[model samples]
Target chain A: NAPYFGRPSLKTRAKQFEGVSSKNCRRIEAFSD
Target chain B: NSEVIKDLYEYLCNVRVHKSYEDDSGLWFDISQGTHSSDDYSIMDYKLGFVKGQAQVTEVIYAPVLKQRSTEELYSLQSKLPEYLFETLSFPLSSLNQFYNKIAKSLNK
Candidate 1:
């Protein structure tokens, strides 16, 4: 198997939320769901 | 009460482009005025990361400066954001304007 990679680009992460409802990622104290 | 966090919250709502409705989706993420004062560097740092994450995921960073005393504090907050987002933690004046413009637009909103 090829080497594993874990980190995702910031843009990629941001895109994940694109068109996604804001309520889905609720913000909490020092954390988010 | 100053309630910087609360002030920040309201400020962000106005500035961020995220739309609450499908008709117009700008950018937005529910934010809480975390219980951290300007002096609370540790708390500010932690909260900064939290806000950064929100901005990263939203593809925008919302920084608002308000109130007299709050204005002074806002710069401190603004500076910290770049530091948290960029590995270099610093930017030239020219490039800095791009980020500042975004923040300024949000401020106007």
Candidate 2:
């Protein structure tokens, strides 16, 4: 399962925000930079 | 004075390029001034941490110059920047450039 861990590095904690709202994730995207 | 934590990125986007914006964004977390005096005076006094999103400020009252006036502290407030300000906000570098000249005389009777 380690090889299948599938961690998202580009936006580490971002998927969690998408469940809250797409807007929030987009904000996080801009915020990431 | 308003009751809201401004969006960390939304707040700084207007500031400029990534580096300059990063530089200014760090200032938002500074708890080093009370606007009544210089920087070290606030540090010597203020409990100073209030990150209401991205800025936390706590004010405290204490001694000026010599907590023992007979002796002396031999440094500028600028000469004494703090890592506490950096760590609490999780920022790495600080080019904070306001508290220097004003407090150069936080001493001298």
Candidate 3:
């Protein structure tokens, strides 16, 4: 098996869910390698 | 006292630029420890892009891993980038912090 290291930093980003409203903000999801 | 660890992971990096929405663009850069497996860094970019509306992987690069005979290699590798960038990409668990911190402090300016 190949071992991977040094993954990206733990980051959270925001996106406008459905629309760009303050109440519609959602945390963007990230999938790992 | 110090001990040497073999089979250390080498360094590699990937960068991407893409369109996130109408009239809006985004950029991302990633650094990864070297590995023997398939470095499919693009899939994550695509997934994140999908969530963000539209995303594309514009650039990908894997740095070369050099043979190491001594600790000097760590010194050289860690010093290759600015402190902020290096610290931004590196982790403390890698055991390279000491080597990374050994470089010139004034160089950060």
Candidate 4:
């Protein structure tokens, strides 16, 4: 997992909305939600 | 505001960028205005975040500028620009044209 960590250097897309949906991750996503 | 929070954005909440949108989809959150005859006033004040399906997932606080003031206040706002609010929303000054484009699109919609 550490090997794949870095900034978006290429044109790869990031689902900014998807990761936020994960139940466990949802708490992490919200700022003041 | 928490002075301990070194990252400016952290003190003013955070935003969840819609990674699935492919292209960053920026929607007009809202526009607000306030006036100050002899003191500081809030220009834009609101909280916005992302939604996971239908529920709000996260939020960000963007305190806008107090517009339409004397040259003194103008510089005051300008100086604060680099500190917060506009700090996150702003892109490179060199790409200012794109900033207008964003404004145009946000308003046109």
- Scored against the native two-chain complex, candidate 1 gets a DockQ of 0.02
Q: Which stretches of candidate 3 lie above 4 Å from their native place?
A: A1-33, B1-54, B63-69, B83-109
Clashes of each: 6, 6, 1, 11
On residues B1-109, what C-alpha lDDT tens digit does candidate 2 reach at each position?
A: 2213222321332111111111321222111221213222322211111122323432211112222211222243334543222221211112122222222223222
TM-score of each: 0.22, 0.16, 0.17, 0.24
DockQ for candidate 2, C-alpha atoms = 0.01
Off by over 4 Å in 1: A1-33, B1-20, B26-30, B33-69, B83-109
Docking class of 4: incorrect
True contacts kept of each: 0.00, 0.00, 0.00, 0.02
lDDT of 4 by residue, B18-87 (tens): 1222113322233232222234432223223223233432233232323333578556555543333443
Query: Native contacts retained by model 1, as a fraction?
Result: 0.00
Q: Which candidate is the best by DockQ?
A: 3
Candidate 3 collision pairs? B10-B34
lDDT tens per residue, model 4, A1-33: 643654321112122112222111111121110
Q: What do the candidate models score in CA lDDT, each in turn? A: 0.30, 0.22, 0.24, 0.30
**lDDT of candidate 1?**
0.30
> Where does the lowest 10-residue lDDT sum fall in candidate 1 chain B?
B42-51
- Per-residue lDDT tens digits of candidate 3, residues B1-109? 1111111212112212222342233222222221122322211111111112224322211111222213563454444433332221212222233322322221221
